[PDB]
């Protein structure tokens, strides 16, 4: 049970319907886990998502970060990819709280659809970091103090 | 928007396609009510992230505008690189949304037609200025006000 | 170095994707750890590779090293690489922030196979759990030997 | 413009000579087309000693101009030294608050790196280049903060 | 190399032991030039893979002017190897910084062994590495000795 935790989401806006999926799958394991109503912030692209990251953790005890990001014909991909992956790692050790990484970064459309949990998806990878989020949160609490 | 500080801060290495991201993110900044954005200009992509540290101390958001094409050489990487962690750093350090509006491209063909010129598919420098204001506005309804 | 380590006070943060191989490690993990005089060192499970720094800094704060346990398997995004990225600048960060060994023994391997050949199972031809737990070890009575006893 | 008043550091590696005293050429140059006879130069042995030593230099100077040749071998040797320089310089810039400008090479071949260290037939000098980007920079940087 | 005085620095040397007859090669070239700069007994500390060093440069560089990092990464068959060096190089450049010193790399991070052997400094090697980093790290602790306050 995860029910005394407090989870924000935060899902950025590029590529809305594999999002909205991705944030489906977040809010379902979340109010199967006791939490009906977690803070859901929106963003534009998954580049604004660390600064908003940083700012749920300093409420929550678990941040998960959804997004969806498709490689195009620049290296323009790479470059977004490494921005996400240094921001959130340095959030969650700065604010020692979990960020759950939901965002996905794909090769095409295809396999991001595959991956957001739609009817015909294989995985969806924003069920799996809000469940992640969750049980680093719930360990976290074991592990500080609790007299 | 029209409560938002905007800064711009926009590298020249490649004058008319950095004008035309300039334009992007100017007339966003207009159209949402911003008429006189902090605008500032450097000389390459490396030199944005100390200038988009200071803009940030007195800004709600930065956006951060540059082009850089792949030349003959690995020096490419290490320059997207650079910007990277860079405005990754300086929008953690200041807690400050730090749009990338810098533009990576193998080809010139490809920083054109993502500049947001007549003829272009995209305006990344308009993109991004969008990102900016609405992460701005988005932290100042997450932020303290009784 | 292996030999001796009653004293060390040690952590194992394992990652459960892929439980087979993660399970194989922490075996390794914590019969090095026994083998140098310590039965019950602290161990804690995570979910992902991701999840490992974050808890990893909080068992930094009262463990002498840390043992980081995991499997990252390349799919078929690019997402194998960020993933690992994350792990290699948290766990580096992590050791640097605590001054404490935070070991990898987190597997990054583009197939099933070698990440199976690399726990330490049966037929394996190493064991990355066993080898990141003297790693940590030695490192962490090394730092012993280097910082003040009068 | 009126670069005068800067205070200018200059640190460039030793490794390739003549490519490296050919960029710190060109970055003296334009440090006294400035106005600016006497920058801080100092010298390292590799690119890697850059940012300590151009660490040092940002607590007393305006802008560092970093210069150095790094020339890929038959190694992956080259990527992690590049990779040093690139996290270390951009540290050091944001840790200071101070332009610490890349004139530092990173080439396939010394054919590419000798193109751009500004000798009399190369295409570009990309010490003048730095020196330029580092001294704008701290104008810029003057003009944005305070000053009654 | 002998060339300076180097007698005042205080140098550490940290070496990885994963490859030992490299490894120690390259502790012999470094130890060689510390002994020709005037210094026979530098602070030498051994650990075991590459990923261990950054860590212990780190205590190091909390009484030394500057510290020398020696290890041996080859390839395998795996992405491991880009993910050991990307730490090392990560470690070692945020502990410079960090503590103001100078932590030169002698860490080899080669394709194969053969590679490794001929940077190690070895009879028949072409270069030693651990002797070049050794004279880089002297080198720049004598540079910050004289830009750094003095009387
Ligand atoms: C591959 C790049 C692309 O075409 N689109 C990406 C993308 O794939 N996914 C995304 O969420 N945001 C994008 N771009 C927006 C970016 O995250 C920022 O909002 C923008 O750079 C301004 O900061
Ligand atoms: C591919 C590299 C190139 O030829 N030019 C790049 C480039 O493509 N784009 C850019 O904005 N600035 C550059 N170079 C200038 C650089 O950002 C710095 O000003 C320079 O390293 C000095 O600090
Ligand atoms: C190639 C990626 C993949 O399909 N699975 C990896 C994997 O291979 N290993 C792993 O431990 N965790 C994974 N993913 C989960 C990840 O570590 C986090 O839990 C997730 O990003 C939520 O924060
Ligand atoms: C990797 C390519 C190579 O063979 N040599 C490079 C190089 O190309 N350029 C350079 O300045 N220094 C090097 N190596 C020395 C390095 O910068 C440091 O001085 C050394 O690692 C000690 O810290
Ligand atoms: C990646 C190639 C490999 O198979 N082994 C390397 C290697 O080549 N060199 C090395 O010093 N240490 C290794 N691995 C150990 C590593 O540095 C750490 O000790 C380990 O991850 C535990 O923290
Ligand atoms: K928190
Ligand atoms: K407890
Ligand atoms: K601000
Ligand atoms: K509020
Ligand atoms: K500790
Ligand atoms: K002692
Ligand atoms: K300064
Ligand atoms: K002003
Ligand atoms: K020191
Ligand atoms: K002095």
């Not at 909205?20 to 534009?44: E, M, N, Q, S, Y």
């Not at 739609?118 to 969750?134: C, I, M, N």
């Amino acid at each position: 049970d995860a029910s005394g935790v407090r989870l924000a989401i935060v899902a950025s806006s590029w590529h809305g319907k594999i999002c909205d999926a991705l944030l489906d799958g977040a809010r379902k394991v979340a109010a199967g886990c006791g939490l009906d109503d977690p803070t859901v912030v929106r963003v534009l692209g998954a580049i604004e998502i660390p600064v908003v990251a940083q700012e749920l953790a300093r409420n929550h005890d678990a941040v998960v970060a959804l997004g969806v990001v498709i490689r195009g014909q620049t290296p323009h991909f790479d470059y977004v990819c490494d921005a996400v992956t240094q921001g959130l790692t340095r959030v969650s050790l700065d604010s020692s709280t979990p960020i759950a990484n939901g965002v996905l970064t794909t090769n095409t459309e295809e396999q991001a659809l595959d991956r957001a949990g739609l009817p015909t998806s294989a995985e969806d990878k924003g069920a799996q970091a809000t469940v992640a989020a969750l049980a680093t949160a719930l360990t976290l609490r074991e592990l500080r103090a609790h007299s």
